[PDB]
Amino acid sequence: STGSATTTPIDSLDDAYITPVQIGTPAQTLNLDFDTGSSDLWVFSSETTASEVDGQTIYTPSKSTTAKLLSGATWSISYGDGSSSSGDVYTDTVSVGGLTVTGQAVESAKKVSSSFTEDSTIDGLLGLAFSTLNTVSPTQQKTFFDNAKASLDSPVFTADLGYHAPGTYNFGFIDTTAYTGSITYTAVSTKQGFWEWTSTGYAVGSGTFKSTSIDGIADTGTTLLYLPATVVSAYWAQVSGAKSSSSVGGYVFPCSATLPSFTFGVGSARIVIPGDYIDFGPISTGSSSCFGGIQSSAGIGINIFGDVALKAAFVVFNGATTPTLGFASK
């Protein structure tokens, strides 16, 4: 089997991407944030505290003839941005782009933190990291990809995120028309539950490539590119007037600037992030200070190849017995 679904930016900045997902019988379609940095499929629901729902579409398990309470199971998750959610668990039929999994754990939110409430465009998350990170207790549950893998034509999914435009998540096949050149594959460590890999270095604009190992995670659920402070300083030093602002919470730059590109290495290959992809717009409405899309990871504990980086590539998440990651230009 295969599946193919379009993923759409939630706003004009590409702050996140939503993909429609069918849950239950008859189908209830929710727009979920596919997140290769976590491993829970959770949704706003009829069980979510009413004051914490503000415009989201909810899953109502009582209206699904295939929903079953997973007795005794609870979940609770906290994300790197400080947001969180928790609740109980149903199993139900879940389909993405024509690919169907029966018996998928659908984690129903009883509580969500304010940032989820305040984002009316995201109805939940669909985790695509390794199932060892799944938070369901006392019986850990598998991701949608883990459940589908055996049925897929090939045990892979691909992320093709657009810049200011829709893109595609495919399951079970590699669309050879969706990228240019060849796909360069690189090793993955699953020891932390992430799609963790080592970039071979970077360049800023037309500058020379610096060969240096940068361990980080391919995370579709993180908006920006978080890299070591040395790398980030070298980037922003090429932008007149750019500075790190403690009050804003990262590097800002004059909105009048033209930003240089940023290149990262994948083995001997190179992925070029155009400068425009690094512009996240005014820090507050009407400001002439703009927020940068490359930020320091120094306070995180891990480097994160988020959407800013991944949207410059066609990315293969290869879930073979030994997982690997593939990157191609597009």
Side-chain angles (χ1 to χ4, degrees), residues 1-62 64-67 69-109 112-141 143-148 150-190 192-242 244-330:
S1 61
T2 63
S4 184
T6 298
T7 193
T8 301
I10 64 166
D11 63 25
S12 64
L13 298 178
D14 297 347
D15 282 317
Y17 298 77
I18 50 172
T19 308
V21 178
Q22 282 72 48
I23 309 177
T25 309
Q28 300 177 41
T29 298
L30 275 66
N31 295 329
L32 305 188
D33 184 351
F34 282 24
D35 180 13
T36 63
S38 69
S39 306
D40 288 50
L41 191 178
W42 73 261
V43 296
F44 278 80
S45 74
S46 58
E47 303 181 327
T48 309
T49 297
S51 63
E52 295 177 354
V53 184
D54 185 6
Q56 296 79 12
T57 294
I58 62 166
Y59 169 58
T60 303
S62 65
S64 174
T65 61
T66 44
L69 179 72
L70 187 63
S71 183
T74 59
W75 62 280
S76 180
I77 193 162
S78 307
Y79 296 101
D81 66 354
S83 67
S84 64
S85 51
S86 62
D88 57 17
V89 186
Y90 293 82
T91 58
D92 210 340
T93 302
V94 172
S95 299
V96 176
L99 169 66
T100 299
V101 168
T102 59
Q104 173 65 44
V106 177
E107 300 171 36
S108 167
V112 305
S113 68
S114 58
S115 66
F116 288 116
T117 300
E118 290 159 3
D119 182 4
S120 69
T121 72
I122 290 173
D123 303 324
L125 266 66
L126 189 149
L128 293 167
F130 292 89
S131 294
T132 54
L133 294 177
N134 176 267
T135 77
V136 175
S137 179
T139 307
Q140 188 171 64
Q141 300 296 304
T143 71
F144 175 82
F145 178 54
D146 222 336
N147 282 323
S151 302
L152 294 177
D153 291 357
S154 181
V156 306
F157 69 91
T158 65
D160 179 9
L161 303 179
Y163 167 68
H164 293 354
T168 305
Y169 280 103
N170 291 329
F171 292 82
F173 71 105
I174 286 163
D175 178 356
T176 61
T177 74
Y179 58 89
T180 63
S182 56
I183 305 177
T184 298
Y185 289 87
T186 197
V188 165
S189 174
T190 67
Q192 296 191 92
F194 300 122
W195 293 92
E196 187 172 1
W197 65 290
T198 301
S199 175
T200 49
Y202 69 98
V204 175
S206 58
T208 57
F209 186 84
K210 175 73 169 180
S211 290
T212 182
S213 296
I214 305 173
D215 181 289
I217 65 168
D219 184 2
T220 59
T222 290
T223 313
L224 307 185
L225 174 54
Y226 294 89
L227 293 173
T230 49
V231 178
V232 176
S233 184
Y235 178 79
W236 289 109
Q238 297 304 310
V239 178
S240 291
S244 183
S245 169
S246 57
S247 60
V248 174
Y251 279 89
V252 297
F253 67 94
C255 293
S256 59
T258 301
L259 295 177
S261 66
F262 184 89
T263 300
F264 64 93
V266 182
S268 54
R270 306 288 180 254
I271 299 296
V272 181
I273 306 171
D276 287 354
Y277 291 25
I278 299 161
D279 180 4
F280 279 74
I283 60 171
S284 296
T285 305
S287 179
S288 72
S289 293
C290 274
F291 198 66
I294 296 178
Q295 296 294 344
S296 178
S297 65
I300 296 177
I302 199 161
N303 301 305
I304 307 174
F305 294 86
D307 297 334
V308 163
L310 302 182
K311 75 178 66 175
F314 178 88
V315 189
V316 179
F317 293 81
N318 170 27
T321 304
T322 298
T324 64
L325 278 169
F327 293 80
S329 293
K330 65 185 186 191

